[PDB]
Design a protein around this ligand. Sequence first.
Ligand code: CAC
Ligand code: CAC
Ligand code: ZN
Ligand code: ZN
Ligand code: ZN
Ligand code: ZN
Lengths: 329, 329
Amino acid sequence: GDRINTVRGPITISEAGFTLTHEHICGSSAGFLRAWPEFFGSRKALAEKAVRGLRRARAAGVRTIVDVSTFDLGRDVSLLAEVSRAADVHIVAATGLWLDPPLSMRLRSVEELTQFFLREIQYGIEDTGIRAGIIKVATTGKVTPFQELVLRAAARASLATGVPVTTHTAASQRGGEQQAAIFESEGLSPSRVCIGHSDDTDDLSYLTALAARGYLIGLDRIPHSAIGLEDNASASAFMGIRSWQTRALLIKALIDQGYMKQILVSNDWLFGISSYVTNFMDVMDSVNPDGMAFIPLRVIPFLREKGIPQETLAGITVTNPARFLSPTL
Amino acid sequence: GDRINTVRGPITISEAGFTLTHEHICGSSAGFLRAWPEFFGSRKALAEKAVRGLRRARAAGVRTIVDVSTFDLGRDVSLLAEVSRAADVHIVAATGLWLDPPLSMRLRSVEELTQFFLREIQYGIEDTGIRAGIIKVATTGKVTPFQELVLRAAARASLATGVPVTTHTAASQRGGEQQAAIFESEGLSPSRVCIGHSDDTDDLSYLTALAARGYLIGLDRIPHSAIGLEDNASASAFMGIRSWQTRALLIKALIDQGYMKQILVSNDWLFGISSYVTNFMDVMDSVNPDGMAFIPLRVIPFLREKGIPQETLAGITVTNPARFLSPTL
Ligand SMILES: C[As](C)(=O)[O-]
Ligand SMILES: C[As](C)(=O)[O-]
Ligand SMILES: [Zn+2]
Ligand SMILES: [Zn+2]
Ligand SMILES: [Zn+2]
Ligand SMILES: [Zn+2]
């Protein structure tokens, strides 16, 4: 499993390089971008903004991003392919389901969901022939019965194809522990799983325990902070009010505890978003003008200043993603 | 002043003919048909089924159907256009929102929803250039805050364009009353509004009181009958336990009250469905083998044999839909 699917086709994992493991071109809903592109100004404006952002990220060293947008997050792979080519940055696309499944998804069995996930990995997404290289799932703190079906379907797709699973958690409710339990009940290896949004909490006991079990730990929202924007309730609700430095110290914390190999770092950024309040993309860009370049431009020097070896940062930003994304049975 | 938009372009009132005013090619979810066409066997198979179904309805006298599938019912106007051309049956497409709006819709303001409905009517659906000729909305009895927004946006779109509004109600909860109040508060003429699924109840005083206020009464679920079987946890809750003759007699009842000009009749049929339990399409087809031809092949002769004159049935199936659909302010 030394080759992975990208929206431009299969690449060898040595080509991935510096990889951001949790990003989005656009945060939306199924069908929404094509039915109402004017919500984003235009489809063209959105594509142009993504190309400019990805190009600047590439200038900073990024060579690959994993777009973890699912069907129900409005994933438009044709858009991902277009901007990947124009920016010349690898984009790995996802299957799976996020927190907004429509009826036609909500009512399906674990067997059906499994077939859908397998379709997008082994056949292609829609009629594009583009194949997902990862499975994205999301749960509330307490996993719902449908969400549990989604996790079991993800595990079975992973076991059949070797592609990894990445999750959305409510880290303040220690959501990963319930996810991990369902995953392991399906015989799935923790090394195939990233428990994401884990920088949303400062509970190191929770993080190290998961890492100790072999789980990848996603510290993937480092630039998200509504500090200075406390009066904006939606900003506080979405990004929290812990500083980005606070988030970044968890990377050091986990290195210091000997878990350098379990860490995955990202921005959780996007170039448009319709799945939150109107104009929110502007609020986010007001806080983090670096966009997806925030990890290489701001976080990497911060960690070096704190004394973390270059070789360590390189293993985290390059080696961990490659071992993670490489289809592994 | 005249033309009605169809998936093949504008048609004149006289071209519409026998019109079924509440139907579906496929009941699904946004993005679903194109992301998982195998759920329906294949897109090709679904299309072939719809064309045969439309051709049979056509041979039974039908010339136009109104597909009231909204964005969130997974309306695929490219499919409607294909099957309309192949069957030579006019199809009117809908805008609006049903009961499963995704997060990118649920967070929107009344102003934004008005823009979306207006773009589907005035500009076109997606990138197809096909314009909606009806606005479809739905409430669940007690109107939720979001649903009230949808209804007001629908009224504002209707008022800007003259295209009519058609609704889904919980008729057993007399839902059409709260809908009418909202519409009227917006300055919408009741003659621009059809209150649908009204045959879901036997409460004629409810129906007559609405008809008296100028509303069109949609008796559009006549074949929906799961009788003889008090043991299906899906078909009984979905289709009810009243005979179709009982539903159809409501047409007679309203005609006798003198309200023939405010009756609209349909099947609420479809050729694929993913927004319920798996294989529910087989259950429906077994219940009503006639599909969309049920109204002309079964209901019309039934009414004729109860004494209803031909010119009255023509008024209902041809004249009432033309007046309803022709954009008017
Ligand atoms: C689509 As998200 C803000 O849960 O990473
Ligand atoms: C798609 As329906 C059963 O609400 O008319
Ligand atoms: Zn997330
Ligand atoms: Zn994300
Ligand atoms: Zn309905
Ligand atoms: Zn319907």
